[PDB]
Design a protein around this nucleic acid. Structure first.
Ligand code: MG
Ligand code: MG
Ligand code: MG
Ligand code: MG
Ligand code: MG
Ligand code: MG
Ligand code: MG
Ligand code: MG
Ligand code: MG
Ligand code: MG
Ligand code: MG
Ligand code: MG
Ligand code: MG
Lengths: 201, 137, 76, 107
RNA sequence: GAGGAGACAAGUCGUAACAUGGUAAGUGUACUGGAAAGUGCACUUGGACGAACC
RNA sequence: AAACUCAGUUGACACAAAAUAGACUACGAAAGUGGCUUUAACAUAUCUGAACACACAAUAGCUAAGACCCAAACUGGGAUUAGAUACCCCACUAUGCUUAGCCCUAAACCUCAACAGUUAAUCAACAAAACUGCUCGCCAGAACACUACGAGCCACAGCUUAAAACUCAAA
């Protein structure tokens, strides 16, 4: 890394800086004073202060990226979000007044809830042994499972936006091959339950 | 009085009562924690059988039997079987140092039954019946 | 004695180099190689102060007497 | 008190046959040995049983799954706390010993 | 007649010993086996058990 | 995997072995001796001394008669392997125990002889510091060789004693 170890990662959060001094604790005051003497890495070209920045969606776009085609990855992500929103609006209009209360229409909420539903609780590690999964690994496994399922060859000629929107809605409703894969992981963990003692941590 | 770990003296004016029953009256839970298998049998104050369980009966096969999980499953099964017989408080009398020695009690508790005493009864020959020759691996 | 209670290696080195050694030897010390061993306590501040004072006084007396004798003779 | 070593070893002038046969000399070293190096299993079993009885559907297992996650977090936190708290240690004890070495020889 | 030993000397089958030699090694004794050898009972350290608590 | 339909509680129940004490260091010449009670009993001297005799000698083993819980060579099966006449699993026999005789071997080693004495001026290395007096036993390169022949022995695929030829410069 061209950055010397002294450089510190940038904190991009307007609220953190607009916070009044009075609300700050002594530890927080000391941290703010110290940061005035430290070097700060240049803000990456990916994340900004836009209120429409969703780190989960940014990470999903990065994962979907192929060969540094960030433009195409972003295009696919926005197309998927638009397709999800349009399907939700169509269902909302086609639905009765009662079901319109239930029918969600926010693509960001749909995406977050779908990935959360696809997050696996217990993993398997060679030691195979059932084991707890850290939160970062859970999120990455959810995202990778979603992307791999969308990239599966079983879908013929269907475009990635449509495929991913359909899979995302299925996951949001707790259905689809992604949830099936999570259930399969859980079932294998249950089957190897007896081997849980092999784990030394 | 501060707790006394010793069991109540037989045939004595002991105050302790579990559901109004004396210690000699509380039923017994014989647990045999063999090296590869664990067995649990619940009997009455008059040694009348009440329930039975084991790793094999719960369904674990071969090496899987000699595991804490199988022991806990057997304990749960035995506790469930005894609950229908009305056993609440039990005196655990465990013999053997198998992996299920403690998981048997844990499953016997998760099945609902309460334990009032633990009594190790592993057969320790002062000396006799020469055991099998040592294994060279 | 060094700080692990073995004899100070300087004792052996001085014996090798033929440098006379005066030395305060305690009961647990090895006095064989010390040219002039002074058997006495060596762990108490009072004893150490007495030794330092005595040696300083002897050295100062010797030097002042040397200068006095040199002046006395050279005056002749 | 330490067990008596008088007359235990095989030595000249010892009429009795040896009582101890130390493969290594019974002389204190100047060092001590280094500190020699499955939790949440019950929670895993509980959650797996709930999955078994609910067809591995989170709808009812929510509670057991939350308990499993909390137990895993607690295990990780305890690991961190033990690791930080571990740093008398063998290093300090050996440093202390070296200042007072065993002397099996004569000065 | 045949056996034994030693030597010369290459192959052959194995790897028994030398490291915890991959089943620690060996003594006596008995059975067994292509072959070093395997095992049984007792004995030795001519092995270790890391040398505070853990 | 093979294997048994037998497994658990409780009661009755040995001719097998003898937790803890034992972190004790004792008894015996050695081998050996660590459940309890009793009987008998633990040589002598104020030295050493036996293939030159007598008496013992772990474990294993032989003959005969009993016992047989458990263990267990061998044997069979299961598994393993390239093969596995083994290591791992199961069953079982001789055998381990008792009686009466044999056999007389152990790394029978504490590899350090008995008795007396010393710590003084040291000591190849390692090991369990170095020695003095006295007596007996034993050794004189390696291998051949715990072998051959002879001899003795309740021993008969044995034990004790025990060479030589050939070979080497090493061991
Ligand atoms: Mg001093
Ligand atoms: Mg080998
Ligand atoms: Mg070996
Ligand atoms: Mg052997
Ligand atoms: Mg065999
Ligand atoms: Mg012996
Ligand atoms: Mg005599
Ligand atoms: Mg003799
Ligand atoms: Mg004999
Ligand atoms: Mg038999
Ligand atoms: Mg022999
Ligand atoms: Mg012979
Ligand atoms: Mg002959």
């Amino acid at each position: 890394s061209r950055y010397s170890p002294e450089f510190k990662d940038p904190l991009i959060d307007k609220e953190y800086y607009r916070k009044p001094v009075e609300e700050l604790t002594e530890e927080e005051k000391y941290v703010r004073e110290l940061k005035k003497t430290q070097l700060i890495k240049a803000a990456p070209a990916g994340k900004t202060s836009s209120v429409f920045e969703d780190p989960v969606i940014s990470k999903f776009t990065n994962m979907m990226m192929i060969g540094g085609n960030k433009v195409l990855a972003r295009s696919l992500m926005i197309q998927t979000l638009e397709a999800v929103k349009r399907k939700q609006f169509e269902k909302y209009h086609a639905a009765s007044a009662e079901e319109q209360a239930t029918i969600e229409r926010n693509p960001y909420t749909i995406f977050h809830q779908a990935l959360k539903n696809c997050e696996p609780m217990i993993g398997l590690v060679p030691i195979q042994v059932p084991v707890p999964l850290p939160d970062r690994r859970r999120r990455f496994l959810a995202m990778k499972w979603m992307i791999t399922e969308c990239r599966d060859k079983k879908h013929q000629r269907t475009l990635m936006p449509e495929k991913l929107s359909h899979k995302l809605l299925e996951a949001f409703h707790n259905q689809g091959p992604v949830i099936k894969r999570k259930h399969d992981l859980h079932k294998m963990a249950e089957a190897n339950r007896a081997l849980a003692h092999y784990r030394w941590w | 009085t501060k707790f006394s770990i010793y069991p109540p003296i037989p045939g004595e004016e002991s105050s302790l009562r579990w559901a109004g029953k004396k210690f000699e009256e509380i039923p017994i839970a014989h647990i045999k924690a063999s090296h590869n298998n664990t067995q649990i049998q619940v009997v009455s104050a008059s040694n009348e059988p009440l329930a039975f369980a084991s790793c094999g009966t719960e369904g674990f096969r071969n090496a899987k039997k000699g595991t804490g999980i199988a022991a806990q499953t057997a304990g749960i099964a035995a506790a469930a079987r005894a609950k229908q017989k009305g056993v609440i408080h039990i005196r655990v009398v465990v013999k053997g140092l198998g992996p299920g020695r403690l998981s048997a009690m844990h499953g016997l508790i998760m099945g609902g039954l309460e334990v009032i005493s633990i009594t190790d009864n592993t057969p320790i020959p002062h000396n006799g019946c020469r055991p099998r020759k040592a294994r060279k691996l | 004695l060094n700080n692990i209670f073995e004899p100070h290696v300087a004792v052996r080195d001085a014996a090798k180099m033929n440098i006379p050694t005066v030395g305060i030897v305690d009961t647990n010390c090895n006095p064989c190689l010390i040219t002039y061993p002074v058997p006495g306590n060596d762990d108490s501040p009072l004893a150490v102060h007495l030794y330092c004072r005595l040696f300083q006084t002897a050295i100062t007396r010797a030097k002042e007497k040397r200068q006095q004798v040199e002046a006395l003779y050279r005056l002749q | 008190a330490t067990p008596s070593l008088r007359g235990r070893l095989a030595r000249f002038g010892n009429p009795r046959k040896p009582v101890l046969k130390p493969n290594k000399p019974l002389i204190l070293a100047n060092r001590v040995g280094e500190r020699r190096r499955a939790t949440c299993i019950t929670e895993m079993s509980v959650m797996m049983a709930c999955w078994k009885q609910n067809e591995f559907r989170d709808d009812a297992c929510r509670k057991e799954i939350q308990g499993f996650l909390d137990c895993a977090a607690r295990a990780q936190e305890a690991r961190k706390m033990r690791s930080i708290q571990e740093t008398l240690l063998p290093n300090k004890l050996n440093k202390l010993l070296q200042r007072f070495p065993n002397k099996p020889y004569l000065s």
